[PDB]
Paper text:
In this work, we diversified a de novo TIM barrel by extending multiple βα‐loops using constrained hallucination. For the diversification experiment, we used the de novo TIM barrel sTIM11‐SB as the base scaffold. This variant contains a stabilizing salt bridge cluster in the lower part of the β‐barrel (Kordes et al., 2022).
Notably, for both crystal structures, a significant number of crystal contacts are formed within the resolved α‐helices that had been optimized with proteinMPNN. Upon comparison of the obtained crystal structures to corresponding structure predictions using ColabFold, we observed an accurate prediction for HalluTIM2‐2 with a root mean square deviation (RMSD) over all Cα atoms of about 1.2 Å but found major differences in the case of HalluTIM3‐1 as the RMSD over all Cα atoms is over 4.1 Å. In the case of HalluTIM2‐2, the theoretical scatter curves of both the crystal structure and the predicted structure are in overall agreement with the experimental data, with a χ 2 of 2.6 and 2.4, respectively. However, around 0.18 Å−1 both theoretical scatter curves diverge from the experimental data, suggesting a potential high flexibility in the extensions, which is especially conceivable for the partially resolved one. These pockets show differences in size with pocket volumes of 1006 Å3 in HalluTIM3‐1 and 2000 Å3 in HalluTIM2‐2.
Author numbering: 1 to 176, 188 to 242
């Protein structure tokens, strides 16, 4: 939980890591990691999930109106809460707020609320690349993209994305001793993505994990941002 994840930020700062990231939904939890040494504070909301599930519910048979409104109402409350966390962290002194979403207009509003790093996390590659281009034309400077393939991050790099997040903790969770063996096979993959991105010349490479030794090793391979993710 909290005190177990905060120990990861303290260790990276202990070992001389100058770019540490932390992901949470509570601004108080993010502020504490900010004092532990994390410079990028990532706010995440369940709003994309509620929108995805409201969209799936609309394609079912029968009366869908009361259920769709209930899901979209929760999405509004989830995003209006995340925007509050961005303001509160800005109110506290946090300089590098990040926000992840699959809707670029939610990213644009978070950018006006105080977020500096915009994380596009659209599953469709051509849908994400369009969201980058749309954010670029609005004047957004720091666009981040998340993928488990380095070639997707290089293509996103050439579209305007400055931060390239290597995330492989989504395929291991889907495939699932033994369970720890498959986790290691994914970490060996994620470390290779960072290596080739450094070879290709990627300037700002990030890496998602929850263990400081995994972020340390990805830091050895060439990761510039060590993201600590509690969820």
């Amino acid at each position: 939980d909290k005190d177990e994840a905060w120990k990861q930020v303290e260790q990276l700062r202990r070992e001389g890591a100058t770019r540490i990231a932390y992901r949470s939904d509570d601004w108080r939890d993010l502020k504490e990691a900010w004092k532990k040494g994390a410079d990028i504070l990532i706010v995440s909301s369940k709003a994309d999930d509620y929108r995805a599930r409201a969209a799936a519910a609309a394609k079912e048979l029968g009366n869908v109106k009361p259920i769709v409104d209930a899901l979209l109402a929760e999405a509004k409350k989830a995003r209006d809460e995340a925007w509050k966390q961005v303001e509160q962290l800005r109110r506290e002194g946090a300089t590098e707020i990040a926000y992840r979403s699959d809707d670029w207009r939610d990213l644009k509003e978070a950018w006006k609320k105080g977020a500096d790093i915009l994380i596009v996390d659209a599953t469709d590659k051509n849908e994400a690349w369009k969201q980058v281009e749309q954010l670029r034309r609005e004047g957004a400077t720091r666009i981040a993209y998340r993928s488990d393939d380095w070639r997707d991050l290089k293509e996103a790099w050439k579209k305007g994305a400055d931060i390239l997040i290597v995330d492989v903790n989504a395929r291991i969770e889907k495939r699932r001793a033994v369970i720890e063996a498959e986790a290691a096979k994914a970490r060996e993959e994620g470390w290779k993505q960072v290596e080739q991105l450094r070879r290709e010349g990627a300037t700002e490479i990030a890496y998602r994990s929850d263990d400081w030794r995994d972020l340390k090793e990805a830091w050895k391979k060439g990761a510039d941002i060590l993201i600590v993710d509690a969820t």
